[PDB]
Design a protein around this ligand. Structure first.
Ligand code: 28L
Ligand code: ZN
Length: 546
C-alpha cells in the first residue's frame, strides 16, 4: 500500500520558471535581503517525490467505527443538489488549467458549445463507467518562501472537463456536509473574527484549559484507499439524486482512490494511491478524515472535554488539563493512535497553557486594544511568508494576489496594516489600478475583489475595531520587528511615515479612495477621525470561484 509508485519520468513545467526573487524599482522600499526570498520549481520535484513516497499501515479500532457511525448518522440528515452544467461552469476559476480537449476555463465560464459538449460526454462516461482510472496531471507548485529551502509541493489534478463534473456531483455536498457532520468543529465556516470568538469561548469554557495543534507529516500522502472509501460512504448517506450517487461512486473508484500520474509533456510519471491535491473533495475529504481520526484518537487518549477545530489537515483541540506530565503522556497516546490510523506527525504536538501560544493554520490568537481601550482578541501570524510573497508580487503579476488575501484575512494585525496596506496602496495609486478588480485566494477559493471595497470587506470580517486597534502585545511586536530585521524590511516608523503620504494621496482622490485612506490609514495620522459603518466552506485544490 505505497502512497506513490514511480516510473522515472520527471515532473515537467509548462512555461518559464523563476527561483530567484525578481527585482524592480519598488523592491528595495519593502525588502533589502533579496537572497532570503526564493520560489519553488519542478527542479526540486524529485526530492518531494522521495518524501511523499511511503508505505501506509492502518489499524482501525472500535473508537474509529464509533466516531464514524456518529458522523454517518449526521451525514444522513444532509440533502444535496445536483448542479447543472451551467451552474458548475460558473463556479470555475477564470485562470484555471485548460482542458487537453481544446477549451479553457474562460471557454467553460462562457458556456461555449465545445466545452459544454465535452462536459456532457465526461458526465455520461462517469455514469456508464465505474472501473477505468481517470488520467491526472502531476505538477510542481510555484510557491514563494523565505530561507529556513523547501522542495516544491505537488499538485495532482484531473482534466478541466472532469472538474466541472465533480462540481455537478459534489459542489453542494462539500459545501453543506462538513458543517452538519462536525458542527462548530468545522472551521472553514468561520470568518477570522468568528474563529477567535469560538476559540476564546472554548478556552474560557474549560476549568483548567489545555490546547494543542496537530501537524500531519504530508497528510495527503497518509490518506489510504480505506479513508477515501470511508469518505464516499459518508457522502452516500446524503439524500442524493441517483445520477449524483453514481457519479460519486465513479469519481471515487476512478479518480479519488488513485490513478495514473501524467506530466505536462504527456509521459507516465507513475501511479497515485492516496489523496489528489487538486480535486473538489480535497478540502472536505481531508477535514472529514482528520476529524474522524482525531475524535477517535481523543477517545483513545481519554482526553477530558475534547473541543476540536478542523480545517482540512490542520487540527486544534482544546480540553481539560491534568498537569503538564499527564498531558504530555495523553498527547503521546494521541500521536500513537493517529499513527495507527495512518496519520503520523512531522513535529509531535506539545501542550499549551496559553491560547496565544497554539499555532492554528500557521496563525495564532493575540491581544491589542480598541478605541475604548477594551482588550480585543484577534488572529495574527508570523509575517515572514506573507512579506516574502509580497516581495514577489512587487515585481511580478501572479494569478493569486497573496498580499490582497493577507490584507483581508489579517486586517487587524500590526504588520498587514502598517506594511502590506501601505506598500500596495502606494503601488495602486502610482499605477491608478485602484478601480481594477484583482483575483486573490481565501480558504483555497478564488475571489475577484475590488481593492477600493477593502474597508467594507474588512468591517464584514473583523468589525470596525480592526481600523481602531492599538497597543499590540510585546511578543507580537517583537516577532514583527525581528522578521523586519531578517528580510531587511524598513522599520515600522518608516511605514507610519509612508502611510501618512498614502492616506494624504487617497483623500485627494475622493470617493472610495477617501474612505480607503480614512478607514485603512487612520492609525497613521496624529489627528484621528471617528470611523463609522460603510463564509460557508474551504475549497483548497477544489477549483472554485465566487
Ligand atoms: C494570502 O491569502 C490568505 N488567504 C487565507 O484564506 C488565509 C487563511 C487564514 C486563516 C485564518 C486563521 C486567518 C482564519 C486560515 O485558517 C482557517 C486559513 C486556512 C487555510 C487552509 C487551507 C488548506 C487546508 N487544508 S487542506 C491542505 O486543503 O487539506 C487547511 C487550511 C487557508 N487559508 C487560511 C491566509 C492568507
Ligand atoms: Zn464504542
Amino acid at each position: 500500500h505505497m502512497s506513490y509508485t514511480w516510473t522515472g519520468a520527471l515532473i515537467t513545467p509548462c512555461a518559464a520558471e523563476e527561483s530567484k526573487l525578481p527585482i524592480n524599482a519598488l523592491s528595495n522600499s519593502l525588502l533589502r535581503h533579496h537572497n532570503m526570498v526564493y520560489a519553488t520549481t519542478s527542479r526540486s520535484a524529485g526530492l518531494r517525490q522521495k518524501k511523499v513516497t511511503f508505505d501506509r499501515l492502518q489499524v482501525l479500532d472500535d473508537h474509529y467505527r464509533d466516531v464514524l457511525k456518529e458522523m454517518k448518522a449526521k451525514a444522513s440528515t444532509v440533502k444535496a443538489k445536483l448542479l447543472s452544467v451551467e451552474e458548475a461552469c460558473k463556479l470555475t476559476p477564470p485562470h484555471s488549467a485548460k482542458s487537453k480537449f481544446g477549451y479553457g476555463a474562460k471557454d467553460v465560464r462562457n458556456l461555449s458549445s465545445k466545452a459544454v459538449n465535452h462536459i456532457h460526454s465526461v458526465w455520461k462516461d462517469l455514469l456508464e463507467d465505474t472501473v477505468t482510472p481517470i488520467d491526472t496531471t502531476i505538477m510542481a507548485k510555484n510557491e514563494v518562501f523565505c530561507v529556513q529551502r523547501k522542495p516544491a509541493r505537488l499538485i495532482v489534478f484531473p482534466d478541466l472537463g472532469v472538474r466541472v463534473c465533480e462540481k455537478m456531483a459534489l459542489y453542494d455536498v462539500v459545501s453543506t456536509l462538513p458543517q452538519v457532520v462536525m458542527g462548530s468543529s468545522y472551521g472553514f465556516q468561520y470568518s477570522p473574527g468568528q474563529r477567535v470568538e469560538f476559540l476564546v469561548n472554548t478556552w474560557k469554557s474549560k476549568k483548567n484549559p489545555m490546547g494543542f495543534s496537530y501537524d500531519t507529516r504530508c497528510f495527503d500522502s497518509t490518506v489510504t484507499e480505506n479513508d477515501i472509501r470511508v469518505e464516499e460512504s459518508i457522502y452516500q448517506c446524503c439524500d442524493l439524486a441517483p445520477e449524483a450517487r453514481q457519479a460519486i461512486k465513479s469519481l471515487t473508484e476512478r479518480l479519488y482512490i488513485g490513478g495514473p500520474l501524467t506530466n505536462s509533456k504527456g509521459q507516465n510519471c507513475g501511479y497515485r494511491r492516496c489523496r489528489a491535491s487538486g480535486v473538489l473533495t480535497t478540502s472536505c475529504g481531508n477535514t472529514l478524515t482528520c476529524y474522524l481520526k482525531a475524535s477517535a484518537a481523543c477517545r483513545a487518549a481519554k482526553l477530558q472535554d475534547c473541543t476540536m477545530l478542523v480545517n482540512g489537515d490542520d487540527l486544534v483541540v482544546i480540553c481539560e488539563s491534568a498537569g503538564t506530565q499527564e498531558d504530555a503522556a495523553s498527547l503521546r497516546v494521541f500521536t500513537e493512535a493517529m499513527t495507527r490510523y495512518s496519520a503520523p506527525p512531522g513535529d509531535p504536538p506539545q501542550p499549551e497553557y496559553d491560547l496565544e501560544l497554539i499555532t492554528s493554520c500557521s496563525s495564532n490568537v493575540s491581544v491589542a486594544h480598541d478605541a475604548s481601550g477594551k482588550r480585543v482578541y484577534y488572529l495574527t501570524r508570523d509575517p515572514t511568508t506573507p512579506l516574502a510573497r509580497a516581495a514577489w508580487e512587487t515585481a511580478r503579476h501572479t494569478p493569486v494576489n497573496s498580499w490582497l488575501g493577507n490584507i483581508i484575512m489579517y486586517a487587524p494585525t500590526l504588520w498587514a496594516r502598517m506594511i502590506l496596506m501601505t506598500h500596495f496602496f502606494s503601488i495602486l495609486l502610482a499605477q491608478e489600478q485602484l478601480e481594477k478588480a484583482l483575483d486573490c485566494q481565501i480558504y483555497g477559493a478564488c475571489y475577484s475583489i475590488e481593492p477600493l471595497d477593502l474597508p467594507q470587506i474588512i468591517e464584514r470580517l473583523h468589525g470596525l475595531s480592526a481600523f481602531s486597534l492599538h497597543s499590540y502585545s510585546p511578543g507580537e511586536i517583537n516577532r514583527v520587528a525581528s522578521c523586519l530585521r531578517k528580510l531587511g524590511v524598513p522599520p515600522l516608523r518608516v511605514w507610519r511615515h509612508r502611510a501618512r503620504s498614502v492616506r494624504a494621496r487617497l483623500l485627494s482622490q475622493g470617493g472610495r479612495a477617501a474612505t480607503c485612506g480614512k478607514y485603512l490609514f487612520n492609525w497613521a495620522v496624529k489627528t484621528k477621525l471617528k470611523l463609522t459603518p460603510i463564509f460557508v466552506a474551504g475549497y483548497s485544490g477544489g477549483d472554485i470561484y465566487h
